Design a protein around this ligand. Structure first.
Ligand SMILES: O=S(=O)(O)c1ccc(OCc2ccccc2)c2ccccc12
Ligand SMILES: O=S(=O)(O)c1ccc(OCc2ccccc2)c2ccccc12
Ligand SMILES: [Ca+2]
Ligand SMILES: [Ca+2]
Ligand SMILES: [Ca+2]
Ligand SMILES: [Ca+2]
Lengths: 203, 203
């Protein structure tokens, strides 16, 4: 009887952890979208700790976790001292690109635009730091679009017009648009819905 | 309108964080009680991260947080290399004793027994590590019961019978009994109740 009670408790804790993960992911996407970067930092710490206390994950929760990891690496995209992979040469934007091409999601025009913007910026942030050999290394791992980028790396022109047309802000805004579609999908999660009900009843 | 929507969202996130804090505290007390120390470690990481994302706390939630901090220091009671206070001389059991005498709770016989057991053990764990000068330092900060303890410190008798009568296990068991009263009080929290309902409907 006491083994079954402990079992019911563990099952209930697994249900609550799954709800908390969904809420933390929604909150992280919202923070990314609003540019509230301190909230994104704190919520990322919370989502990571919650995931370490989970054992089973549904496919939707794994997809959810991958999106949160992508956003974390995009936010750390200019932080070339961040190591997101066991391979220490993989820059944050290269790490986000690997997740982007691995999430089970539709490959619509927005998916491709974000992918191409991340590739250009993975190079541009190396040029911006003066790491011209590292931009060349990044380029060989990611790659007509290709020939212009290699030309820029060899010419060492960091503030090239191409990097302004396909800028970091353009990349962020397109990722924000995608995040808006994800934010609408599960603004319908249990914790968020129940919290919203409480708020609306106190008005 | 968009400022009010952001406001409603922040209020709802504050309601959800408050529910998650309550659930994590219940889960931490349960882990302490069952002696599932890896779960206690992981859940303590989760409760800390959640609290860093909260701004307002009700009195009941502060009391709740204090109990969780006490349990963490009791579990780290034999870890003399743990620093829980800005004063680096305060040992984990001395740190738990300060919280125990600071929680707004009834001072029943169990409260006093736990207090006296923590005081004896704050000394005993220094003797067990061979830190006889540090046991003397701990003794002066905490303190007929007093004269026996000072006699033991000066006699350097680490494996004294007094430390077996008022042992670490006796201290843990009495704290576990208290934790059982706390665990029954808010096994009634929102997240836990709703998770239990889902589990019972899938049986
Ligand atoms: O900062 S990172 O991108 O590196 C990051 C790491 C781990 C995380 O969760 C633990 C984990 C989930 C899945 C597989 C294995 C570990 C993250 C959850 C959300 C957001 C970011 C996360
Ligand atoms: O490991 S410790 O005991 O040091 C500890 C520290 C901080 C914590 O939360 C952050 C915090 C809450 C209240 C005031 C300021 C900070 C803890 C929450 C639960 C359990 C333990 C915690
Ligand atoms: Ca680097
Ligand atoms: Ca596929
Ligand atoms: Ca020490
Ligand atoms: Ca008082």
């Amino acid at each position: 009887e006491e083994e079954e009670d402990a079992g019911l408790v563990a099952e209930a804790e697994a249900v609550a952890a799954g709800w908390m993960l969904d809420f933390l992911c929604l909150s992280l996407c919202r923070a990314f979208r609003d540019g509230r970067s301190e909230d994104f930092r704190r919520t990322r710490n919370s989502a990571e700790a919650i995931i370490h206390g989970l054992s089973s994950l549904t496919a939707c929760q794994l997809r959810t976790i991958y999106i949160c990891q992508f956003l974390t690496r995009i936010a750390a995209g200019k932080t070339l001292d961040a190591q997101f992979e066991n391979d220490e040469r993989i820059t944050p934007l290269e790490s986000a690109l690997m997740i982007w091409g691995s999430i089970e999601k539709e490959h619509d025009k927005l998916h491709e635009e974000i992918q191409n913007l991340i590739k250009i910026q993975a190079i541009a942030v190396c040029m911006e730091n003066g790491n011209f050999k590292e931009a060349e290394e990044v380029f060989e791992r990611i790659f007509p679009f290709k020939s212009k980028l290699l030309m820029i790396i060899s010419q060492k022109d960091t503030f090239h017009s191409f990097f302004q047309h396909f800028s970091y802000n353009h990349m962020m805004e397109k990722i924000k648009s995608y995040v808006n579609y994800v934010l609408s999908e599960k603004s319908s999660t249990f914790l968020m819905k129940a919290a919203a009900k409480v708020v609306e009843s106190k008005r």
